[PDB]
A paper describes a structure:
The β-barrel assembly machinery (BAM) complex is a conserved, multiprotein machine that mediates the folding and membrane insertion of newly synthesized β-barrel outer membrane (OM) proteins. Cryogenic electron microscopy (cryo-EM) structures of the BAM complexes from the gut commensal B. thetaiotaomicron and the oral pathogen Porphyromonas gingivalis are similar and reveal a 7-protein, ~325-kDa complex with most of its mass on the extracellular side. Remarkably, besides BamA and BamD subunits, Bacteroidetal BAM contains a 14-stranded integral OMP that is intimately associated with BamA. The remaining four components, named BamH–K, are all SLPs and form an extracellular dome-like structure over BamA that may provide additional functionality to enable the folding and assembly of the many β-barrel–SLP complexes that are a hallmark of the Bacteroidota.
Class 1 lacks density for the periplasmic components but has good density for all extracellular proteins, whereas class 2 has modest resolution for BamA POTRA domains 4 and 5 and for part of BamD, but with poorly resolved extracellular areas. The crescent-shaped BamH subunit is positioned over the BamA barrel and forms an arch-like structure approximately 60 Å above the OM surface. BamH interacts with BamI and BamJ on one side and with BamK on the other. Based on its structure and the conservation of the protein core, BamH probably functions as a scaffold. The highly conserved N-terminus of BamH is wedged between two strands of the BamG barrel and interacts with the conserved BamG N-terminus, and the tri-acylated BamH lipid anchor is positioned at the BamAG interface. Of the remaining three components, BamI consists of two domains. The small N-terminal domain is conserved and interacts with the BamJ PPI, whereas the less-conserved C-terminal domain contacts BamH and adopts a six-bladed β-propeller fold, with each blade consisting of three to four β-strands. The conservation analysis of both BamJ and BamK indicates that their putative active sites are directed towards the interior of the BAM dome. BamH–K all have glycosylation sites, with by far the most present on BamI.
Residue numbers in the entry:
A (entry chain J): 27 to 214
B (entry chain H): 34 to 95, 98 to 436, 446 to 492
C (entry chain I): 28 to 196
D (entry chain G): 18 to 537
The structure:
Amino acid sequence: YAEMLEDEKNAVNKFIKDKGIRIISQDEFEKNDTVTNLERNEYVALSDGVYMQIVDRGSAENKTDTFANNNEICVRYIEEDIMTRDTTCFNVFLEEWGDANQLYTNPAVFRYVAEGSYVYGTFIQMDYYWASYYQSTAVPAGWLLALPFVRNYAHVRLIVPSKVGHSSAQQYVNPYYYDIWTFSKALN
Amino acid sequence: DATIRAFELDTIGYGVNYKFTIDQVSRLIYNVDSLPVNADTIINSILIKTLTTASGIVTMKDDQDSIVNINDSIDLTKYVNATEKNNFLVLKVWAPNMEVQNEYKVNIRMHTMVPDSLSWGKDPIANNPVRNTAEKQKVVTLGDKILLFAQNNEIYSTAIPAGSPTDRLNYGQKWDKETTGKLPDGADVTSIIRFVDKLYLLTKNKEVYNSNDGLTWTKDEVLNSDGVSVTNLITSFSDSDGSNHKKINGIAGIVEINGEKYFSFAEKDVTWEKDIDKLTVVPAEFPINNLSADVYATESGTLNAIVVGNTEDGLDNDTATVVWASEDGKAWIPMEIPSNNNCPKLVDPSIIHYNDAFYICGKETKDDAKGFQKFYTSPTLLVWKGVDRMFMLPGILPPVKSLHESSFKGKEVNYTMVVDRNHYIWMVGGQGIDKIWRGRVNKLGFLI
Amino acid sequence: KYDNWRARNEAFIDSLANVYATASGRGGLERIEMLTAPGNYIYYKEMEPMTDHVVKAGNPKYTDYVKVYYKGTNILGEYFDGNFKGDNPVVDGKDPSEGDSPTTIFQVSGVITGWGEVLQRMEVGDRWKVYIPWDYAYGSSGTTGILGYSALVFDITLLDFANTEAELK
Amino acid sequence: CDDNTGGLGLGMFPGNDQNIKGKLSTFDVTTESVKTGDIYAKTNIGYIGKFTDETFGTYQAGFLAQLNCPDGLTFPEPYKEVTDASGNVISATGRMVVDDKDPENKDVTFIKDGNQIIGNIRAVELYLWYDSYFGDSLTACRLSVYELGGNGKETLNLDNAYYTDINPEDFYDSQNILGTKAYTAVDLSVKDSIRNLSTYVPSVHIAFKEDIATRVGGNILTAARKAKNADKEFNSQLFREAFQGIYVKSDYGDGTVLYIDQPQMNVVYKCYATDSITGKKLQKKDGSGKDSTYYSYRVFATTREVIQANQLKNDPERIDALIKEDKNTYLKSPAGIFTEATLPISDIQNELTGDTLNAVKLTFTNYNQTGDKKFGMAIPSTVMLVRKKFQDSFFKDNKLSDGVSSYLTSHTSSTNQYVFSNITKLVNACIAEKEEAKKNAGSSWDETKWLQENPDWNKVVLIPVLVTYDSSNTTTGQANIIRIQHDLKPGYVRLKGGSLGKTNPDYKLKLEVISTDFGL
């Protein structure tokens, strides 16, 4: 197969229809102030085919400390494979693996670059699981499309197609789902 | 038509190779680092290699000039230490055109005595001069003399030669009574302490006495303040002890301010600090009697001091001889060890810093191996090991085919010790040993 | 510029060789016999001895280590390599445009035959300027930066020599 | 096939072609030592130790750190039996040992709230992991650790931290000591066979006494239970109410400075083994026995989601004295001394107007290290030159090297030089700034007034920096820079030129510029 692998849209449509999920266009997302309603399970159709839901826009009392260029951002997440419905990557605590202290003790941290074009990001510290499993330092480009829409300590959920995935998703043409429990500005 | 060289020899110990210097101007070969004493059984049939030169034809005088067996083994035991009774392995090397002619002479340098071994000799070098050897002992060095004090106002002495620890010195066989005698009333001899050029002493009534030469003693006007009272003098810090970048000069001790014990430091020619808000309290685990101390320079250029001694008569969960250190005179800190690497409980322990390591000796009380049994050593002050080999206690002889009658090993007696400025260990035994022992590790006397 | 390099370099060596044999005061030159080729000579010039000798009498051996300030130049005076670039080694140098020179460690058996012959006859703190033929330099094709068949001239200061690096560095 | 014609032809080319010349000219730069100020450190390494130097005096360091707690982390639920009407046990849930009075459970201490047992504590232990260190590695040293917070004390926050001289005595109280440990930075208590392993990372292991362990572990466990019972989740802010953090202090020892990479705390507890189907306790498989148990733990560590700070104390009088030397300038790295240079931008702007600048070279050069000390301070390997307008803003905004306002260079040990080799962009930037100021002012311009104000228009500073690279794109090697930060390990170098160059021309640097002169 060469072009047949780009049928990932069928798998994403399967993953959508398997659950209660509604699609909102960005031109509606930016006009009902800015929120994806959680009682209705809204998702925005972002650029490059990313579907994204903000669960908590973050920093609700300060409202000012948004992300920007040259920041270093800490990420905690759990990654689900779309094609076979399996938890593939994580660095967060859950009771089913509570005693595996190596997996969740340290977060992933990346530098955020936002010059006039071509936003990109590089892991400074990879988590143990990512560092052993995927062994690459390039951040999934789908994550970086969400930063301009959220603040510090935000909680977001993303569906990322292959064109903007990581170094494995781009080769084996596999979309993924990320439950980003937290974006944080890096301290110390 | 050259005579270039790379002369080499194979492993004597497993993985151990010895380097040879090549003096082409003077035409001779030798190894700078001498072969160990063990090697005279190994070089009995040994192999030469890497004897590379412009043309390999080489011969040794035998009457004939027979060719070298470069690929075959050779007995070198005839050619060791060839500088006197000179018997070099002398060999001739030819140029590729056979016109230019040269000879080189080879010397296999080998030790006559084991380097890292503590040499006590066959016998103790002198008897203990003290009358009634059951009395308390103390030994200290001052200038060019070694002094031995006894509690009954009794003093003995011996003198040291001109200098240079590497020279062929002999001393200690004769001891003299310092006939003026009369160290002060009520003194406690085991408290005697050195400073830059003076000796200090403590009495039972807690007066401090001092001397310039050990012959005569007086009270001093600077340490005997009112209000305070001294109870122990620990050690003294000075420029003479090391290389202190901290610039510390004075005496460290313990003073009982208003009935409670505090560490205090008497800086050069001024009285003890007595300000109770900025002294520190002596812990209950700290040694009380028969203290020993040493001062040395850390590799950073900063002085450090270490002490051991007898504790109070009874205290909880105590099973080991912990050593207390201090970077200055204000506060001592214990080198407590959580693991099993902690040395046993010892009675009247003594500590020294010596040949880039630390050593402790004392007598044990486990009732199945009582007495002095071995030295204990540490490379880094926080882990302690027993030495089961060289560096033994005095009187422990190797097989000449044994235990010497006046040896410390297995005895339980009073004693004292010191290290002089030629790095001789001096050990003095009381009732039950009655002798003076002297020793040094051979590696400290070598010119290398 | 670099025309007929070999002949002119050899002619330079011959000029020094016969100046030592005919000029008054030897023209300032002095010479040593070469042990790798008896009958050949290396020519050198004595210079200002140092004033901070580490008091190490004797001369270095073939298989032991050496600490030096050195500079290497070709017949035209152009730079090849060294610790210093002016006309003297720099220590506590007043001029803020030049740094104090580092010291370098060599093994007498690990250098060109000219160095290997002359270093075995210095005493610590001698300064010599030495003139070596292309037979005993790198020679033939030469190294990087050497045009082949080149007679190098070196300026050497011997600071220290020892059996191992760890007692010298 | 020839392609040269040599040089024949010049002389009949037009004047604007054959008049162009190259030229080299030099201008004078003065340099002086300046104090560091309040730098923004913000590093993840914690420095602990002390050492003495004969030139700079005593250097002492210690650090404060908060411990993290992952979202939703909890300790296993207490083991609870279920019985039918006969008293016979039928099923059970939970895993943690909860029953006292049993001589088999004298190995742990049970902890409570109200009158109910919520769990047990076996031990609490701190590991301070470190990859490397500075100085000698057989000098014995001692370290002691305190719990942060208390009655009336301050707490770490985004404004208090990242200054290298916070006074810890108002963050902690001396009576809250947790423990102490003696260490040597190479622990000869551990066998060589273990220390050679590739998986071995050194640490100081400073586990607490039973009373302290009970107090700390009970506080943490009761906070976790109090969060769980309210259907909250035990995020780090709730953990910080039970254990604020640690202060790590150096009591004794001279020579070692440890680079603590991650402080880590384990809380250890006792658990039953339970049947996979029916949940009951397993009986021991050996002879005799009463039940089967094992020990398990939860981990709390400083992981860049929480605050960590350092105290890096230089000897102030010695530093102030060395700043006042005028024959030389220093570069003492851990918040010590920088050197400031004044560029001759006005002279370049006057003398080389109409030229194309092809290179502007500035060189700093140094004396050798003194004393031949075995474990002495090293020369800073990488330094940054930055316009003084951006001295502190550069590190506070986490910028990378700009090219037009800051440069990086390595030490050239073969010549004892820092050389920057082309700073043309910075010169053009300064010239453009002044020309724009003159253009905006117009006829009311005054050159002397504008040079008397804005005195740091043409000033640059030289700073020791630590530069780190990415590792990817490895086979087609590129090695991009991803973080520049202040160098905080001990190190120094003495540079030539100095404050006396303000008056005496022997002590003044030269800046070398080469350009194309069109002869117009």
